[PDB]
Every structure is written in C-alpha cells, then in structure tokens.
Amino acid sequence: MDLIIKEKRDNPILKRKEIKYVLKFDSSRTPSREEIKELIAKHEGVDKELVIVDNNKQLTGKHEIEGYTKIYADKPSAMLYEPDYELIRNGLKQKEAK
Template structure:
C-alpha cells in the first residue's frame, strides 16, 4: 500500500492541516479507515488520534482510493469542531446507547 499526498493545506483558524490523498493498493482490497489513518499518521509524523479521516472513495474496479483527512494540533480541538458521527467513525468517542 502506497500513500501519495495530492494537496496539503494549513488551516490555522481551525488548528489543523487539511490533506487530500491517494492510496494505491494493487492486488488487494480497499484499505479500512483504520489502516489509512495509520498510514497518514506515519507519513505526516502525527499521532493517530489527531488524524480525522473525513471521506474515502474507491471507484468500482479501481485499485486507487482517494480521500480527505484533517490533522488537528490536538485531540481536544478535533472533539470541539468535528460532528459526533465523524468522531464515532474515527473511534475518538463511543456511540451512545439509545433507550
């Protein structure tokens, strides 16, 4: 699996770096969100908990996944800014049980 950063933009107002990326995964399935977060954290020298994967898309029959991620300065800023469903997808908070 190979990661290529297509665009990297600093957003000081929201205390984050926004990244558009492409993951090449020849002869294998689409990588999980967790695998992509680990790959982004390793390549951008960031803690995995600060990496918020917003979206990923793999066209049918393709071995390339494109996506958008945000790397926050700290986890607290991510929890203040991001909606709950994104935080749940990225395993930063637990899903609330409905009664």
C-alpha cells in the same frame, strides 16, 4: 497500502488541516487500521492522534482511493492533559474569545 499525500494545513484555534490523499491497496488482504490511518495522518503532516478522514473521491479506475482527509492536532494535547482535568476553569480574554 500506499498513501501519497498532498497535505494542506490551516491552524487557527483548533489547528485543523486539509490534505489530499490516495492510498494504494494491494488486492489480497483487508486494509490495515494503522497502515492507512497512520500513514494517512502522519504523511498528512500530522500524528496518529490527529487523523480524522471522512469521504474519499476515487479518481483513477485502478484500485486506489483518493480524497480529502481531515486532521486534529488537539487530540494528543488533550489526551496528555486530559479534557476532564481542571485546566483552569475561567476562559480566555485576549480582546476576543474567537
């Protein structure tokens, strides 16, 4: 697989990003999970935890797929501290919750 990415990231409260991606796949074996997903996010400007990619706009007519990928950077931070772990239980109040 060959992923050429044109990443664009916007990080607010949840550090969400938007990137342009094309994976070139060699007709022979089924696409790999890590190869596409890792190279997609990693290239994406993010780690493997941050890889969320839905929909894919195919422009070319050869054998590679293009589209937009979504990435979450909170996946690792949440995994390290665990979402089911008592982080504080109270919430924030910096002049506005959002």
